[PDB]
Amino acid sequence: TYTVALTGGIGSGKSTVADEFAHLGVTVIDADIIARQVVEPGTPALLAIAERFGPQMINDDGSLNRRRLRERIFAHSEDKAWLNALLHPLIQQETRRQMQASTSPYLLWVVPLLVENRLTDKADRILVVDVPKETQIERTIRRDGVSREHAEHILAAQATREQRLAAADDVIENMGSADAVASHVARLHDKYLMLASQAASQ
Ligand SMILES: [Cl-]
Secondary structure: OOEEEEEOOOOOOHHHHHHHHHHOOOEEEEHHHHHHHHOOOOOHHHHHHHHHHOHHHEOOOOOEOHHHHHHHHHHOOHHHHHHHHHHHHHHHHHHHHHHHHOOOOOEEEEOOOOOOOOHHHOOOEEEEEEOOHHHHHHHHHHHHOOOHHHHHHHHHHOOOHHHHHHHOOEEEEOOOOHHHHHHHHHHHHHHHHHHHHHHHHO
């Protein structure tokens, strides 16, 4: 299936761009969403986490108390492997299920912040969500509860803004009026529909 990679640094707001594509019927594959889905309220995996580590793992709406789980793994690094053994097969199965259930002309793949492979191994086109460096820092401080220096450190460990822009086929600046960002998405959506038709004609 014709695949567009959606990439962007921390604080780029790319999940809001992904949502705009989703609103046009595009299947969005996002490992961060799928990881939350496999431990949703009522799931066997969430029960296993609570039965091992305790009822403090579950908040009052039934969802995972992520910080309490992070604390447990931080105290006992051996429980990383247990958690990966529980969740990794579920994440693989759910990723594949969502891909197989897709009926859209193309797929949008939200690239993780830590990328292991060349994006061109998977993507037919690369879309970078770009914002100024200071916007990344500002948004990360507000959303993630980190200090400025921490945000600057995360940036230093990610691909640079310049490397991301150079690798991109298209760039969407997640800046200015939200209406205009959404119109930019709609314009790119048309380009991707045509490219998917061209790829399928072959
Ligand atoms: Cl292309």
